[PDB]
Amino acid sequence: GIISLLDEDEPQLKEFALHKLNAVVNDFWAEISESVDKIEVLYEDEGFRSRQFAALVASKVFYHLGAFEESLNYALGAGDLFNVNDNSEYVETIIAKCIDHYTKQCVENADLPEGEKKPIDQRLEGIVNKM
Amino acid sequence: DLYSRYKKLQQELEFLEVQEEYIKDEQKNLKK
Amino acid sequence: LEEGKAGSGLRQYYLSKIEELQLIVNDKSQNLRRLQAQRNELNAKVRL
Amino acid sequence: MSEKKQPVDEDNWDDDNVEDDFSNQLRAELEKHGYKMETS
Amino acid sequence: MYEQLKGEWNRKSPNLSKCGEELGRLKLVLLELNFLPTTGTKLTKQQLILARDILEIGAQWSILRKDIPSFERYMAQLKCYYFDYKEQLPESAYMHQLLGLNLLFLLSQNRVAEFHTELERLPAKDIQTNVYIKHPVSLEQYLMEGSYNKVFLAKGNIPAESYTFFIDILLDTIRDEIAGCIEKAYEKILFTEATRILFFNTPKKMTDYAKKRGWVLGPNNYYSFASQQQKPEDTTIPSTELAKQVIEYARQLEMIV
Amino acid sequence: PPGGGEQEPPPPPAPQDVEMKEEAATGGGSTGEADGKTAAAAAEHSQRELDTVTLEDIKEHVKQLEKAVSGKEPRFVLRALRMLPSTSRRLNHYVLYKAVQGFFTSNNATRDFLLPFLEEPMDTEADLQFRPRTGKAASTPLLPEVEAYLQLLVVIFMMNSKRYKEAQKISDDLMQKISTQNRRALDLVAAKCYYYHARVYEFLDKLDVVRSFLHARLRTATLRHDADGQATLLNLLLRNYLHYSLYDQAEKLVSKSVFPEQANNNEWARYLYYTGRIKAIQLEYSEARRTMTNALRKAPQHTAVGFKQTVHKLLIVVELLLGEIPDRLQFRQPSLKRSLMPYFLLTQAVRTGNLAKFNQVLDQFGEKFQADGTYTLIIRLRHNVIKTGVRMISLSYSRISLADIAQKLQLDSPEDAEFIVAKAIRDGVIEASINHEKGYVQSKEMIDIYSTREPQLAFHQRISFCLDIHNMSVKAMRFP
């Protein structure tokens, strides 16, 4: 019910409510599925300090809904608040798919030596060598 | 061992996909 | 945890990976021997 | 095979279809049902 | 801190400035600590008395100012504060009519499935007492069987404030159902059927439906056009999908060899 | 001692002998079938688990003095079982200690040594290789330990035993479930520990503490793959949120985890009960009663079981929310006598047009209606008091005058008879129609339900299910 707090248009009310999101996102799984439209926005809303810490709670709800590439791109957009983490059942699965996405990318890039390679994000290879 | 087990599962998996293929093919061609 | 951090990070990646790769090979050998005997019946027809 | 969903738990021998149809419609069925004719 | 408890509410509230100060009061309370764990600590239940009271007065201000999205916004957080896990919480006496505001509002926007699933939380206040909750459930009972007119007659009896922003939308979403019953292809009726079915001997409402819809009073006659469909049917035109439907029969018989 | 004490020597030893060889051959058989031919769904796993629901609860209730279940803890205090000699050493000890407990007195469990019967049996080199052995022989000593019901420093004996057993389950869940998949065993183990930990939180405060952990077990479920793990935990997670009489049901409407997709005829049966409870309260009546009907006819293979008394109790209400009513009490039970008398006398008044009798039923039997979790009937069944007869008339007659239907429905006014019939057709009670000119309520068209493509629709349903049995049978039949 704190999604109603996320409607209200001041900044310091937002992050306190979405500090409360990843506190109980493991207990209120599917209610946040309707708040997807609010977050996928707030992430596009650039001038606020509520975009990477919103990309955390975005990555949690697509993880429950099975949207795994959605959790993959948004844990990239979660920035350093995701990359600092090392121990959960959550984080080790989406970085395992990140290795899966990376090794199917690199073999695909090995198929075409004549330039034409893919633009590769650097946070995903930044956690490859971190691993 | 943890890498060598992983490739040996792949090689067998590639193999017994081929053997289920032609037996399903042979049983079709054997009915004629 | 010298190995306890290594068991859940870089071995649990492998242990979760080889699990279902065992389950499919456990599945296909059941499916293969079904296809074997079904070919064994029809070939026993035709040779007779 | 419990489900742990237990915790609480011709007279009328074959009558309940006929009983759900009619129950108390002056069951003697004569003093009005046969005695229309003095009203007509 | 301790900011404007009953400044412009108990006498009169035409102001929007204290609404911006209640916004500042929302900034003070939700920067005190939190409301999420609520482990023990009656001392941190002290501002929980305050935080619920200032959202009661925000709810009273929300319905007074004729605001639809914000009224359900504060009411949800009020309901979140009666969603307290560790609820010692001596009874704030505004709760039952506060629910009756929401219970009547959520009847009004035709959330009838949400209407009855909200009613679970009250053990005996529905029947024994509490006319504030007894009024919408007796109202919803009147919508059930055939009883349109008792709704429109028992409008003029409210224990609380007049519930005016709820009931006018509530009756308007009854009028279109009577309209949607009478907007059929049944062609013509007269003004006395407007009084019986629609309502109101000679109103401004007959001018309302004259300008919104048709239903124009001609020679003492309303003309409602035919809302009848055309039904272009061949129904052998499921010939491709029927020929398709046969194919996966023989496919699923074969192909596993 | 001369009356019952001479018949005290016969009850230990034969349950000490042949009931012991049950799980000795099964736990030996389940282990070797976990080693080779690991897909053992068609094995003794199921019926032994059908036994542990049924047999061992009624085989033993107390911890069985003279060393049948009180002897299990000095029996399995010393189990190394680690290497092939360490097994064959303990296979000699399976001969020795069972003979000593069959002859003489070992450590007698006088209902108090349960935590040193959880450390030292788990100690003395007890394996996680035999994690089905530790899983079964920790979940099975819950049952002498709960069903004593003395509850004096035993709630923590429950609490420690579950957290020991589930940390063993967690140690399986992270470390090397190599071709084993103990979830088949540990689903009902997670259930049976938390049927009574729910009962613990019935004697004391609320059980949302269970639900936060139960989300976490369902969070680690559904990610690996679903093999009954998501199925068993979903009915558990739904039950308290339905048991609480707060708002509580829009959480389940958004619960999009609707698929176990196969549930061995028993999870799926009561899963359809709980979701039928949900769709009935949010007014989706017609879909609710048909899945309540599906739930009723799915597990009747019981003996006066009581939840069959519950699903039969709700289904007659929701059809009284649709007008029709069948025969109900024709299968009277030793317990149905209490539950037939309200509801049969209820629908007795529903079929009639009487209301002062109907309110007399409410004052007579309101306490049972409040006990059954069906407060809500009085606000929703008074709707169908008028909707029963108007469906009955529109089924009987063909072209009725609305002036005549007012006296026949005792409506006491001919003018609102338009409105009820308008409510019937707009909500779709009858497919009839009103002529608003001279009182006609005329019925449908002529019956044309053979030459209008409708027999093909039902015939396609029966194709798509029957040959689907055929393909599922051929794959399931040939394992070797």
Q: From CA E235, how far away is CA F373, in angstroms rounded?
A: 48
Query: Residues F231, F236, F241, CA angle at the centre, nearest 5°?
Result: 125
Question: Hey, which chains touch C, using 3+ CB pairs under 8 Å?
Answer: A, B, F
Residues of C with CB under 8 A from a CB of F: 7-8, 12, 15, 19-20, 22, 26-27, 30-31, 33-34, 37-38
Q: Which chains touch F (3 or more CB pairs under 8 A)?
A: A, C, D, E
CA dihedral F62, F63, F65, F71 (to 10 degrees): 170
Q: Sheet harboring F433-434: ordered strands across?
A: F399-401, F440-442, F433-434
Sequence-distant (≥ 6) Cβ neighbours of residue F423 within 8 angstroms: E145, E146, F429
* DSSP collapsed to 3 states, chain F: CCCCCCCCCCCCHHHHHCCHHHHHHHHHHHHHHHHCCCCCCCCCHHHHHHHHHHHHHHHCCCCCCCCCCCCHHHHCCCCCCCCHHHHHHHHHHHHHHHHHHHHCCCCCCCCCCCCHHHHCCCCCCCCCCCHHHHHHHHHCCHHHHHCCCCCCCCHHHHHHHHHHHHHHHHHHHHCCCCCCCCHHHHHHHHHHHHHHHHHHHHHCCCCHHHHHHHHHHHHHCCCCCCCCHHHHHHHHHHHHHHHCCCCCCHHHHCCCCCCCCCCCCCHHHHHHHHHHHHHHHCCCHHHHHHHHHHHHCCCCCCCCCCCHHHHHHHHHHHHHCCCCCCCCCCCCCCCHHHHHHHHHHHHHHHHCCCCHHHHHHHHHHHHHHHHCCCCCHHHHCCCHHHHHHHHHHHHHCCEEEHHHHHHHCCCCCCCCHHHHHHHHHHCCCCCCEECCCCCEEECCCCCCCCCCCHHHHHHHHHHHHHHHHHHHHHHHHCCC
Q: Which helix (H) or strand (E) holds E223?
A: strand E222-223
**Which chain F residue has its CA at the smallest distance from C23's CA?**
F179
Task: Tell me if residue C46 falls in helix, strand or coil.
Answer: helix
Q: Is there a contact between F30 and F40 (Cβ–Cβ < 8 Å)? A: yes
Measured in whole angstroms, how far is the alpha carbon of residue E197 from the centre of its chain?
24
Q: What is the largest CA-CA distance in chain D?
A: 66
Quote the DSSP letter at residue E188.
E
Q: What residues have CB less than 8 Å from A39, skipping those under 6 apart?
A: A18, A54, A55, A57, A58, A61
Separation of first and last alpha carbons in chain C: 68
Q: Do chains D and E touch (3 or more CB pairs under 8 A)?
A: no
The DSSP symbol for A49 reads: S
Write b or e for each residue in F4-40: b if 16 or more Cβ atoms lie within 10 A of its Cβ, otherwise e. Answer: eeeeeeeebeebbeebbebbeebbebbeeebeebeeb
Q: Which of B13, B16, B26 sits opposite C21 (nearest CB)?
A: B13
Q: Do F475 and C22 touch (CB under 8 A)?
A: no
- Amino acid found at D32: K
What is the distance in angstroms between the CA of the first residue and the CA of the last residue of chain E? 80
CB F300 within 8 A of CB F308: yes
Q: Tell me whether residue D32 is exposed, middle or buried, using C-beta atoms within 10 angstroms of its C-beta: 0 to 12, 13 to 18, 19 or more.
A: exposed
What's the Cα-to-Cα distance from A98 to each of A73, A105, A131, F7, F61, rounded to whole Å? 10, 10, 11, 69, 52
Output the CA–CA distances (angstroms, integers) from residue C18 to A102, A129, B19, E112, F177, in the order listed.
19, 22, 22, 51, 11
Tokens of E174: 């009854």
d(CA B25, CA B18): 11
- Quote the minimal CA–CA distance from A101 to chain F in Å: 18
Task: Please indicate whether, in this complex, the C-beta atoms of C14 and B19 are within 8 angstroms of each other.
Answer: no
Rounded Cα–Cα distance for residues E137 and E116 (Å): 9
Are the C-beta atoms of residues A101 and A124 closer than 8 Å to each other?
Answer: yes
How far is the CA of F383 from the CAs of A65, E69, E114, F350, in angstroms?
40, 32, 18, 11
User: Which residue type is seen at F330?
Assistant: Q
> What is the rounded distance in angstroms from the CA atom of residue F294 to the CA atom of residue B9?
43
- The packing angle between helices E164-182 and F417-426, to 10°, is 90
In chain B, how long is the greatest CA-to-CA distance? 48
Tokens (6 digits) for D24: 């108390």
Closest C-alpha to F394, from F424, F353, F369, F367: F424
Token pair listed for F91: 């296979």
Resolution in angstroms, to 1 decimal, for this deposition? 3.3
**Which residue is associated with the tokens 């609010």?**
A38
The two three-digit tokens of residue F45, written as one number: 């796993």
Q: Is the dihedral of CA A7, A9, A13, A19 positive or negative?
A: positive
3-state class (DSSP) for residue E45: coil
Provide the 8-state DSSP code for E224: P
Which residue in F307, F338, F351 is closest to D3 by CB distance? Answer: F307
Closest partner CB to F309 (pick from D4, D9, D17): D9
Count Cβ atoms within 10 A of the Cβ of residue F310 and give its class: 0-12 exposed, 13-18 middle, 19 or more buried: buried
Do residues A125 and C4 make contact, with C-beta atoms less than 8 angstroms apart?
A: no
F366: buried, middle or exposed (CB in 10 Å: 19+, 13-18, 0-12)?
middle
* Strand, coil or helix: E222: strand
Nearest residue, CB atoms, F250 vs list E85, E117, E252: E117
Closest by Cα among F375, F191, A51, F160 to D4:
F191
How many CB atoms sit inside 10 A of residue A64's CB? 20
- Tokens encoding F234: 């979903």
What is the DSSP code string of C22-36? HHHHHHHHHHHHHHH
- Select from F249, F214, F251, F262 the least CA-distant residue to F235: F214
Q: Which residues, 6+ apart, have CB-to-CB distance to F328 below 8 Å?
A: F312, F316, F340, F343, F344
For residue F254, report the phi and psi dihedrals to the nearest 5 degrees: -85, -5
With H, G, I as helix, E, B as strand and everything else as coil, classify residue E189. strand
Q: In a mutagenesis test of the A interface, which of E19, E31, E36, E68 is the best target, namely the one with the most A β-carbons within 10 Å?
A: E36
Distance of alpha carbon F465 from the chain centroid = 26
**H helix and E strand count, chain E:** 11, 2
**B18 interfacial to chain C (CB closer than 8 Å):** no
